[PDB]
Amino acid sequence: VKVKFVSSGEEKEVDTSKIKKVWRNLTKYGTIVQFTYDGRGYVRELDAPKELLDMLARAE
Amino acid sequence: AKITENYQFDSRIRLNSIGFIPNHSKKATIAANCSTFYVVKEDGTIVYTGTATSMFDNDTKETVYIADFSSVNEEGTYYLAVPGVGKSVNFKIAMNVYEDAFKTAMLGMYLLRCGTSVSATYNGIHYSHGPCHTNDAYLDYINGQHTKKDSTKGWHDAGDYNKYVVNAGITVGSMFLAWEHFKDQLEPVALEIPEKNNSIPDFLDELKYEIDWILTMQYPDGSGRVAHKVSTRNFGGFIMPENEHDERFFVPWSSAATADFVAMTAMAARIFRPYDPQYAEKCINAAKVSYEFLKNNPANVFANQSGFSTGEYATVSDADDRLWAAAEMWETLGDEEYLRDFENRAAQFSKKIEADFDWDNVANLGMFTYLLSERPGKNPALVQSIKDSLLSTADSIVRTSQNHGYGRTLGTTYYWGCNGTVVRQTMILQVANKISPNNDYVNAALDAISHVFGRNYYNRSYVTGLGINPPMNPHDRRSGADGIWEPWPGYLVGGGWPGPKDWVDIQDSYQTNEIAINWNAALIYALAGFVNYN
Ligand SMILES: [Ca+2]
Ligand SMILES: [Ca+2]
Ligand SMILES: [Ca+2]
Ligand SMILES: [Zn+2]
């Protein structure tokens, strides 16, 4: 599936098949899911497709 | 011999724009092909000729050239001249080179005070505001009653004005550890604060203004639960704090806030006793009430704060917070019960010391207190396991900084607030150096400092009002709402992420360009070790 994310002021999309690393940060507001792909991006946890969240859980 | 060419500043020559200390490391990163370099006094006298060495900066994916001028050890003002490139900004070499920056970071804390007017003149610029948030705070969300219980004072947390216990935890803890670690260095220091003529060391006066607020956060029912924050319902706009009239509320308790409270107040009790013994007794009695609650209610509890839209600071676990609380109760009081709590908790950490830590993961503070205590009775094996983890982790930070093209202790890791962690890592390095003296640890601490003062990709200081091309546009309401071009001084901005080039110095970027008490506290600890230094 497609992960939509904003980078350098542009709406961008990446399919999770092309996503390499996935990990989390806790901010003062909630969780961010960072990733790399064949590029860097992030989404808020609540904006993440479950498939990305599955990948995070496996990496963890 | 004097330089014979006229050198112009070149932004590819990146170094600590404050300067350097005799007998410590001094490096520049030159993001340009070069070889020879000179260190030059202001009149053009050459004091050193060297050869820069190539290194791949894996972080930015480019080769940089490292100019190592550590052997220059005569106090003065200098610049680096690099044939084919240009010159650096001027810098100082001096034993006291960081004292002004320390005092400026402390000024930032003063200027964050809530419940009072503040005023300071910095670089000829008068920063001020009138008394704010003098009606803190109402109990409706705690007990249903529109009753005010005094919750004034403390520091505004960040670019907003709300006050959060969990973030106060790492902030106050790190600053109290600067005091304990560096007491003889900090106790004589005078600051630009209203309490400059009292009988209390000025560093501690600033902390007392925060502890005065923390002490108000226990529930009025006497249970020992600690409210998570004092907040407006929603974020206010870019207005001066004295113009924010919306009601502020105590927010329902969390177990982490409660544990952080115990740690902070137990530290305050031992720290303030020489100076304000009645206050010290108040602090320890309050710590005991909340510790007893924690003993009787072991579960992790998140604050019920979804009726608010301000900072959450919802640490995922309180296990680290409870470990820290036990350590501090033990160090202040010495009772076997507190030691036993601490040791039982600590022995279960698989990794005793973590390199990357902040408000969510405060166990390192308790590990530090435990390890450095002079009290008898510690389990020898647990001491050794913590010690080994400390030294292993410090050694890893040294390697990371040596292998990074800009000396960044945190390597290639970037996230919201990561600039604070870069300097917070100086705690690990300085505690390691107390346990096992090693100049590499101290030099790595100075690499962290140098990184936030201009030895970085951007060639910029990350601290408002200091060094080369500092941040001008923090996500900071006072700075945005006042009549002054330069932002309020002395604040370490949070930093860019996800990448090493992603900082944007624009007011809208709360993600990369906010301020925060926990970031300033880390900077304060880092600089404190170099105040009144030998
Ligand atoms: Ca004083
Ligand atoms: Ca925690
Ligand atoms: Ca302004
Ligand atoms: Zn205020």
Residue numbers in the entry:
A (entry chain B): 2 to 39, 45 to 66
B (entry chain A): 42 to 575
The study reports:
As an important step towards this goal, we have exploited the plasticity and stability of artificial 7 kDa affinity proteins (Affitins) derived from extremophilic proteins, such as DNA-binding protein 7d (Sac7d), which are found in various Archaea such as Sulfolobus, Acidianus, and Metallospharea genera. As a proof of concept that Affitins may inhibit different glycosidases specifically, we used these libraries (L3 and L4) and those we had previously designed without an extended loop (L1 and L2) to select Affitins specific for the inverting endo-glycosidase CelD from Clostridium thermocellum (EC 3.2.1.4). We also analyzed an Affitin specific for the well-studied (retaining endo-glycosidase) HEWL (EC 3.2.1.17) previously selected from the library L1. To analyze interactions at the atomic level, the crystal structures of the CelD-E12, CelD-H3 and HEWL-H4 complexes were determined at 1.1, 1.6 and 1.5 Å resolution, respectively.
E12 and H3 Affitins, which are derived from libraries with a longer and randomized loop 2, present a protruding convex region that penetrates the catalytic cleft of CelD, thereby validating our strategy to use an extended randomized loop. In both cases, the Affitins bound the enzyme by inserting the protruding extended loop into the active site while the β-sheet 2 rested on the CelD surface. The structure of the CelD-E12 complex suggested that Lys29 was the main residue responsible for binding and activity inhibition. It formed a salt-bridge through its nitrogen NZ with Glu555 of CelD, the residue that acts as a proton donor in catalysis. Finally, Lys29 also formed H-bonds via the main chain with Glu353 and Tyr354, which fix the artificial loop into the enzyme cavity. We observed that among the residues of CelD interacting with Affitin E12 (Glu353, Tyr354, Val357, Tyr455, Trp538, Pro539, Tyr551, Glu555), three residues were not found in other glycosidases (Glu353, Val357, Trp538), while Pro539 was found in only three other glycosidases, suggesting a high specificity of E12. Furthermore, all these residues are outside or at the edge of the CelD catalytic site, confirming that E12 can recognize residues surrounding a catalytic site.
